[PDB]
Amino acid sequence: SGFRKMAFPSGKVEGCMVQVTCGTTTLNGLWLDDVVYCPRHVICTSEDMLNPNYEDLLIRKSNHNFLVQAGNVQLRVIGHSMQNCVLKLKVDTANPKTPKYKFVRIQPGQTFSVLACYNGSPSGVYQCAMRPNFTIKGSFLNGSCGSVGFNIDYDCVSFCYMHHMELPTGVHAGTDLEGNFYGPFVDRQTAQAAGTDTTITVNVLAWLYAAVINGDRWFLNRFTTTLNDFNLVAMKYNYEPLTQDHVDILGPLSAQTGIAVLDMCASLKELLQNGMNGRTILGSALLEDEFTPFDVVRQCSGVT
Amino acid sequence: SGFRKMAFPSGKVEGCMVQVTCGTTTLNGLWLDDVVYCPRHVICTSEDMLNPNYEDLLIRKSNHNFLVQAGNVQLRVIGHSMQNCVLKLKVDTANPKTPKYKFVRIQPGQTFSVLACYNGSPSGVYQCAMRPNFTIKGSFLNGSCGSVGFNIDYDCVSFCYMHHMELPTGVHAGTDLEGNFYGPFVDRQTAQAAGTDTTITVNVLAWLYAAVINGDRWFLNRFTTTLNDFNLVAMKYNYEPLTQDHVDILGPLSAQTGIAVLDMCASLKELLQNGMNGRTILGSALLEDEFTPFDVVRQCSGVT
Ligand SMILES: O=C(Nc1cccnc1)N(CCC1CCCCC1)c1cccc(Cl)c1
Ligand SMILES: O=C(Nc1cccnc1)N(CCC1CCCCC1)c1cccc(Cl)c1
């Protein structure tokens, strides 16, 4: 029993963190096989970031300008290429600690763990959600660029995020491991609008199921609702509209608890319209949307 | 910017997790050097747990009865000894992945990361606080016993907790790495009272400083208070009384932000007496007490 914002064990990802220095700029890199992945802005100075011409900036750089340090040992760079907003530095040595991995582009609403790094050294690990507006509410300071987001299915690490930028609003923006930004963001020191964000409805419902499993039941009621009725309330409170796909993915939790999905929606409708009335659900005084239905099942069953 | 409930990177601790089986009972072990540490209740069956005579139960066991599996390889047990509520199994091989480590008994109010494990396999990592009543609000299921709590200063892992028991109230109880329980708990299937818990005042104040640093300032006011006045309010709202030692440890944050400790106490007094009025602080709709002053400084500065 109990329910926590659980991160994946960071071990397999720690063994891939390296420091990348190009000129005066230092950030984090991801060493998988004989390739080091890092944000392309490693080739910039603070001055260049206003409107960098990355093609031109990269042209003035050679393999020997990219200093890659794995803990304390130097890696020999034999190739360099820019793919979208990432630099791929071919090294002469394959990382002996490379785990089984995939590069995946996660969907908005999906969660992942972040291993925050500075100078190729890990500082901490936390569990995040990719917001519906493609930003993340991380904890990142200067030098955190290159820190990655990931998920782990048994021995396979699926890399999904690489940290690039902090928007002037304090939220974070980054790319998949092919350098494609999540959202409309560009790697430039300019004010960039993150779209209107919404609450991930399916995740809140999953977290309401986790609360039922762990004892918190005060929010349960004698009501039911329809997808149409629930969606009118979801619209009013800036919640993602619930679809049959979300209901279908909530199947396992509905079956384990015996609480129909639309009955749980009715509880969420009352919590939305009336608040928590000074009460808490799983230690939180608000509706938590950073646990997917899969995260709840994994944590409640003990999937290692 | 941003502020998250950050766990330490779990890598150094993952390399020490083993599975321990004695008869029909399987739990987690901690392999450091040539010793495997696990909860002594590994020698019990469900039936024995009502009032186990561990001395007698251990007497019926030999080195060959303790099956220790590190991932997939078997460890040869050459010795066994009970120290308080832990079993120390001497193995013939030193763990090649043993990091620099210490065994420390943490104080109530201090925080640590937990690497939740099942069958010697890690499932996740979360950041916890040792409650003032010596319980932890973890996420642990059957088989999680043996999962450890720890802190990391550069390359040294300080082990502070080992999971043993879930109280009938859903909270968790365990020992330091010498087998001494935190709190009045005994490793027996009996209803055991966890004392009246309080909120860790110094940690809430540290988290109020973290909010100021990260932009959340709405709670700041034109008021100040005294330690005496603040403590009358702390008493009324079940908060640990604030002492000069707590004020002294808040020094760094007070100096970085320019907000005197007693001024921040005055903000906490108004939040206690008036609530949050439908507002949030660092994404939380309640007063967070699971970040110590040191955790806030570490996260805000980027200590790896
Ligand atoms: O956001 C950034 N950093 C940051 C700070 C806090 C948290 N998360 C990240 N940067 C700064 C990167 C530059 C620093 C000076 C040397 C050249 C690299 C940034 C600025 C604009 C666009 C991009 Cl893509 C990145
Ligand atoms: O709390 C326990 N487990 C648990 C479950 C969920 C979360 N955290 C832990 N146990 C169960 C251990 C017994 C299970 C059957 C075989 C013999 C070992 C326990 C029961 C009484 C006292 C003690 Cl010390 C431990």
Structural domain that includes position A186: 1-14+100-197
State the angle between helix axes of B201-213 and B261-274 in degrees (0 to 180), rounded to the nearest 10. Answer: 100
Q: Are A111 and A171 in contact (CB under 8 A)?
A: no
Using CA atoms of A54, A59, A64, A68 in order, give the dihedral in degrees to the nearest 10: 10
Rounded CA Rg of chain A: 21
If asked whether residues A257 and A123 sit together in one domain, one would say no
Q: Is B41 a catalytic residue?
A: yes
Point out the domain boundary residue: A99, A127, A153: A99
Closest CA relative to residue A284, chosen from A212, A220, A207, A230: A207
If asked whether residues A148 and A257 sit together in one domain, one would say no
Q: Are B164 and B85 in contact (CB under 8 A)?
A: yes
Active-site residue, selected from the candidate residues A38, A44, A128, A145: A145
For residues A124 and B97, what is the distance between their CA atoms, to the nearest angstrom? 20
If asked whether residues A294 and A205 sit together in one domain, one would say yes
Measured between CA atoms, the residue of chain B closest to residue A295 is B124
Per DSSP, the three-state class of B20 is strand
For ligand 2, is residue B40 a contact (CB within 6 Å)?
no
If asked whether residues A184 and A254 sit together in one domain, one would say no
Q: Is A145 a catalytic residue?
A: yes
Phi-psi region of A22 (alpha: psi -120 to 50; beta: other; left: phi over 0): beta
Task: Determine the residue type at B262.
Answer: L
| Ligand 1 neighbours by CB, cut-off 6 Å | A 25, 41, 44-46, 49, 140-142, 144-145, 164-166, 187-189
Close Cβ partners of B90 (under 8 Å, ≥ 6 residues apart)? B34, B35, B77, B78, B79, B80, B81
- Pairing verdict, β B73-75 and B111-118: unpaired
If asked whether residues A185 and A268 sit together in one domain, one would say no
Instruction: Count helices and strands (H / E) in chain B.
Output: 8, 13
CATH number at residue B284: 1.10.1840.10
Phi, psi of B78 (to 5 degrees): -110, 0
**Contact criterion met (CB < 8 Å) for B303 and A119:** no
For residues B185 and B205, what is the distance between their CA atoms, to the nearest angstrom? 30
If asked whether residues A247 and A202 sit together in one domain, one would say yes
If asked whether residues B155 and B10 sit together in one domain, one would say yes
How many Cα atoms occupy the beta-carbon half-sphere of B27 within 13 Å?
28
**DSSP letter assigned to residue A56:** H
Active-site residue, selected from the candidate residues B22, B44, B145, B265: B145
Point out the domain boundary residue: B197, B224, B241: B197
If asked whether residues B50 and B138 sit together in one domain, one would say no
The secondary structure element, H or E, covering residue B263 is helix B261-274
Which residues does chain B have within 8 Å of residue A171's beta carbon, measured at their own beta carbons? 2
If asked whether residues B84 and B128 sit together in one domain, one would say no
Q: How many structural domains are present in chain B?
A: 3
Residue ranges of alpha helices (H) inside B79-221 are 201-213
Documented resolution in Å: 1.8
- Strand-pairing partners, residue A77, are A91
For ligand 2, is residue B85 a contact (CB within 6 Å)?
no
CATH number at residue A82: 2.40.10.10
For the purposes of burial, counting CB atoms within 10 Å of the CB of A196, is it exposed (0-12), middle (13-18) or buried (19 or more)? Answer: exposed
**DSSP letter assigned to residue A256:** H
Rounded CA Rg of chain B: 21
DSSP A127-165: EEE--TTS-B-----TT-TT-EEEEEETTEEEEEEEEEE
DSSP A80-122: EEEETTEEEEEESS--TTPPEEEE--PPTT-EEEEEEEETTEE
Residue with token string 């005496």:
B228
CB neighbour burial string for A37-47, b if at least 16 within 10 angstroms, e if fewer: bbbbbbbbeee
Residue ranges of alpha helices (H) inside chain A are 11-14, 54-59, 201-213, 227-236, 244-249, 251-257, 261-274, 293-301
For residues B176 and B160, what is the distance between their CA atoms, to the nearest angstrom? 5
Closest CA relative to residue A301, chosen from B208, B116, B298: B116
State the angle between helix axes of A261-274 and A201-213 in degrees (0 to 180), rounded to the nearest 10. Answer: 100
If asked whether residues B10 and B116 sit together in one domain, one would say yes
If asked whether residues A178 and A120 sit together in one domain, one would say yes
Alpha-carbon torsion (B199, B304, B146, A152), positive or negative? positive
Point out the domain boundary residue: A69, A99, A129: A99
How many CB atoms within 10 Å of residue B153? 12
For residues B174 and B160, what is the distance between their CA atoms, to the nearest angstrom? 10
Expressed in angstroms, the distance from the first to the final Cα of chain B is: 16
If asked whether residues B48 and B130 sit together in one domain, one would say no
